[PDB]
């Protein structure tokens, strides 16, 4: 009966991975270009509204967000495979992400992020680089994700 996502630590692992995802893509030069948009979710939080939102209402923002991201990483790993010279370093991180989201998308489905989604209630950004994909990555993770799980973890 574990709603695992709640154990602060269990989640912290990913946030800290992305910190590494970033910390590497920065020292990255031209070999971090995507050569394509790659639509990622909007990671900016405005507390004077979020605080005003409701779990359920946030949840969606998150579920949809996670999804879209997950589509990206794949699309990233992808464009990265067929690549001639796949910056090995980049490789690994691109992968951990792929899996991280997989495990996460699950732990959320737990809390009820999906059920609290397709419930008819009452953005575009694009990474032309990896350096940014990861930036946008963690920013959503520790950003909106981390901020939701909390209130929702009761």
Interacting residues with other proteins (CB under 8 A): 2, 4, 7, 9-10, 12-13, 15-16, 19, 43-48, 51, 77, 92, 95-96, 98-100, 102-103, 106-107, 125, 135, 138-139, 142-144, 146-147, 150
Minimal distance, residue 83 CB to other proteins, in Å: 16
Interacting residues of 78 by C-beta distance below 8 A, sequence separation 6+: none
Read off the DSSP letter of residue 112: T
Minimal distance, residue 122 CB to other proteins, in Å: 24
**What are residue 129's DSSP bridge partners?**
33
- For other proteins, which is the closer residue by CB, 59 or 143? 143
Backbone breaks in the chain after residues (C–N over 2.5 Å): 122
Residue whose token pair is 């930036």: 135
Minimal distance, residue 146 CB to other proteins, in Å: 5
Minimal distance, residue 120 CB to other proteins, in Å: 25
- For other proteins, which is the closer residue by CB, 7 or 54? 7
- For other proteins, which is the closer residue by CB, 50 or 122? 50
- Closest listed residue to residue 22, CA positions, set 142, 136, 143: 136
Q: Are 42 and 135 in contact (CB under 8 A)?
A: no
């Amino acid at each position: 009966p574990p709603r695992l996502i709640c154990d602060s630590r269990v989640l912290e692992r990913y946030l800290l991975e992305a910190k590494e995802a970033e910390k590497i893509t920065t020292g990255c030069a031209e070999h971090c270009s995507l050569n394509e948009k790659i639509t990622v979710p909007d990671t900016k939080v405005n507390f004077y509204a979020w605080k005003r939102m409701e779990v359920g209402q946030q949840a969606v923002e998150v579920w949809q967000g996670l999804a879209l991201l997950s589509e990206a990483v794949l699309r990233g790993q992808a464009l990265l495979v067929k690549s001639s010279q796949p910056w090995e370093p980049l490789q690994l991180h691109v992968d951990k992400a792929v899996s991280g989201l997989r495990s996460l998308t699950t732990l959320l489905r737990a809390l009820g992020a999906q059920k609290e989604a397709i419930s008819p209630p009452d953005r575009t950004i694009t990474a032309d680089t990896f350096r940014k994909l990861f930036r946008v990555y963690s920013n959503f993770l520790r950003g909106k994700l981390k901020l939701y799980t909390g209130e929702a973890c009761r």
